Write a protein that binds this DNA or RNA. Structure first.
Lengths: 150, 97, 149, 49, 181
DNA sequence: AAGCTCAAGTACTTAAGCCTGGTCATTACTAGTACTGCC
DNA sequence: GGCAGTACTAGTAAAGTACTTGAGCTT
RNA sequence: CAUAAAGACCAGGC
């Protein structure tokens, strides 16, 4: 009944609506509607659930292994929503918010990393253009990288 | 009033003035333009370009923010209007009381 | 662990491969006692080893080369005193650790339906650190919705 | 300080307190739209009811 | 496209003194579409700097319209929406705050003609001395003038009548020494 | 067809004293001009 | 000596209220 | 007698 009130019918109009909700006026292009949704929950440069958060994420779904990637996958959210339906029907109970398996201390070095990854995603866009601004192979010291956005 | 807006320097090459010094200087430069450019004495169906500039000049004395704010270079804050000193759009109503 | 997200860069007609070795800090500015008695900012530059190679496809000129620089200056991060405090401009600084809810999935009671009655509903909320939100809530019409950002 | 001067404006202008306010003083008494026509005529290019 | 596109223009109410790099920032933000898609031409009536020359009197005024950009782009209604999306622009101009009304091209060229029109009547053109009409700039009779009454192309001389002391003084001068009326 | 009220939808709201501390930066990008090096 | 490149420097990019309004239901 | 701006944010007392 969510599908019946769903206006979209395929992958394309879903990406059009996901761009259009993130200013409800227009469809962007062919390419930016893909790149924005890939930069919502499936790319480290805009969405990093850092590598501890995968380990805490696996215990919320009773997974066996604890290692994995930082960004989410297409199999995780469906398995979460199954547990949402199961808690709605009556089986199972709520989870503990304040338990320390969920309530985690973030260290000072990890905070410096989380204030350095902001400059990394800008300086990657710097080295993209300064790959083309280099003459032949002089782009190591300064013609590649800037210390201003970091 | 003349002495209500002084023009003294702060220290060296910097200044501390009111935000009314940038707004009363515009309304007067958008006043005689409709009088003598525009020497007509026309039907009112012709002229557009001046009251779009003069009304734009007096709106910054009226209100900034209800359609379009008035900002300065490297400043994403509206110019402190005469109503904005009373109602405190920038949060200075929490500073007046 | 954050360096290795920006090294594979793939430009069409460039064929660039950037491989990493290690980071080594350079020299500091002064010691731990001149940052209080003086106006020492103590901005230690961060220099990083790099290994890049180029295979250009624009026009064959017959000249190819691989010039390698040992250290390149990127960023100005402060360092740590022998106890564990920082300095940036003039003063001593300590960053407090952060404790909040996990980057995962949760199942609380309800939110949003405090205006109406809001009888039985269950819902999920995810807290990321950067990006957009992702919620999955219900309505009195028994339909599952989504909230992004 | 006490003495005043006045600026002769050739064309008169509006007071936006009487315009963007929801109880429109020139929309209720004088039967125009209270919000719509004010965002149609004043700043824009509709001419000399 | 199946139907031929028809490009139109609009007017962009922005800040005064804040306009030319808003056009440059239209080039910045709306970069990288490999085309010739939507933009036809940008029109910048202001200059990014100012001239030392201003009004002759402080009573005398300007016909300039600072902060009013004119951009060509199809939606139909495009080039005030996506020009306010470039920052330091006051609003959205025309029919309503989401939908401008279209104007013709000749009205746009007339808005350019309001820029091109200058204040050419405080009535001076001098470039002129008591003779009628030339400009001598050499020797004794510099900053004076007259008429070459007898032209000598073979001798390369011009017999110019200088009105000094209220009296004509016909003197023969070179082509490089004078400027022809 | 006119119209009359009703309900959901929407935007907007104002955040219970005063007091000093220290600090921190007041803008970094574009355009024109002037200076210097090379042909 | 003249022209072009570039660097320096001065303008300049939570949980509620009211209130609106769209729609469903009658003379 | 005149000068130390304005504002933001944080910490602190009760």
């Amino acid at each position: 009944e969510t599908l019946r009130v769903d206006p979209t019918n395929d992958r394309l109009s879903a990406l059009v609506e996901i761009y259009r909700m993130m200013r409800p006026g227009e469809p962007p292009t062919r390419e930016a509607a893909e790149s924005l949704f890939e930069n919502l929950f499936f790319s480290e440069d805009r969405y990093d659930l850092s590598a501890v958060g995968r380990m805490k994420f696996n215990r919320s779904l009773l997974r066996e292994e604890i290692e994995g990637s930082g960004i989410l996958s297409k199999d995780d959210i469906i398995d979460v929503m199954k547990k949402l339906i199961d808690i709605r029907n009556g089986k199972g109970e709520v989870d503990d918010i304040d338990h320390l398996g969920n309530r985690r201390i973030r260290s000072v070095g990890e905070m410096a990393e989380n204030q350095f990854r902001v400059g990394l995603v800008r300086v990657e866009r710097a080295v993209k253009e300064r790959l083309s601004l280099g003459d032949l192979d002089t782009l190591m010291p300064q013609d590649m990288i800037n210390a201003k956005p970091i | 009033p003349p002495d209500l807006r002084p023009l003294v320097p702060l220290d060296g090459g910097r200044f501390a003035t009111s935000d009314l010094n940038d707004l009363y200087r515009r309304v007067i430069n958008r006043n005689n333009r409709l009088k003598r450019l525009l020497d007509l004495a026309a039907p009112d169906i012709i002229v557009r370009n001046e009251k779009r500039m003069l009304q734009e000049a007096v709106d910054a004395l009226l209100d900034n923010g209800r359609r379009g704010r008035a900002i300065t270079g490297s400043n994403k804050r509206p110019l402190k209007s005469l109503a904005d000193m009373i109602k405190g759009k920038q949060g200075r109503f929490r500073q007046n009381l | 662990a954050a360096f290795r997200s920006v090294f594979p860069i793939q430009s069409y007609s460039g064929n660039s491969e950037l491989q990493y070795v290690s980071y080594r800090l350079g020299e500091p500015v002064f010691d731990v006692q001149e940052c209080q008695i003086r106006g020492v900012t103590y901005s230690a530059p961060l220099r990083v080893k790099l290994r890049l190679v180029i295979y250009e496809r624009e026009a064959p000129e017959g000249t190819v080369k691989d010039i390698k620089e040992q250290e390149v200056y990127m960023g100005e991060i402060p360092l740590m005193t022998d106890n564990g405090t920082f300095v940036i401009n003039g003063t001593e600084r300590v960053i407090v650790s952060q404790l909040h809810r996990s980057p995962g999935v949760f199942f609380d009671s309800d939110k949003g339906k405090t205006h109406s009655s809001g009888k039985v509903l269950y819902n999920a909320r995810i807290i990321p650190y950067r990006g957009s939100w992702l919620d999955f809530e219900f309505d009195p019409k028994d339909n599952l919705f989504v909230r992004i950002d | 300080r006490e003495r005043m001067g006045h600026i002769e404006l050739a064309s008169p202008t509006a007071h936006i307190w009487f315009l963007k306010s929801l109880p429109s003083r020139i929309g209720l008494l004088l039967d125009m739209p209270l919000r719509d026509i004010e965002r149609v005529l004043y700043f824009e290019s509709y001419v000399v009811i | 496209m199946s139907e031929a596109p028809k490009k139109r223009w609009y007017v962009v109410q922005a800040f005064s003194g804040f306009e030319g790099r808003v056009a440059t920032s239209l080039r910045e933000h709306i970069k990288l579409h490999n085309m010739e898609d939507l933009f036809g031409e940008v029109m910048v009536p202001t200059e990014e700097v100012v001239e030392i020359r201003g009004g002759q009197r402080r009573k005398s005024e300007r016909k300039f319209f600072p902060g009013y950009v004119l951009v060509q782009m199809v939606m139909n209604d495009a080039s005030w929406h996506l020009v306010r999306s470039v920052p330091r622009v006051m609003g959205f101009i025309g029919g309503t705050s989401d939908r401008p009304a279209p104007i013709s091209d000749k009205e746009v060229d007339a808005i350019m003609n309001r820029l091109q029109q200058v204040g050419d009547k405080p009535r001076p053109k001098t470039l002129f001395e008591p003779g009628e009409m030339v400009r001598v700039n050499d020797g004794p009779f510099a900053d004076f003038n007259g008429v070459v009454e007898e032209v000598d192309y073979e001798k390369s001389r011009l017999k110019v009548s200088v009105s000094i002391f209220g009296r004509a003084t016909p003197v023969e001068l070179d082509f490089s020494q004078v400027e022809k009326a």
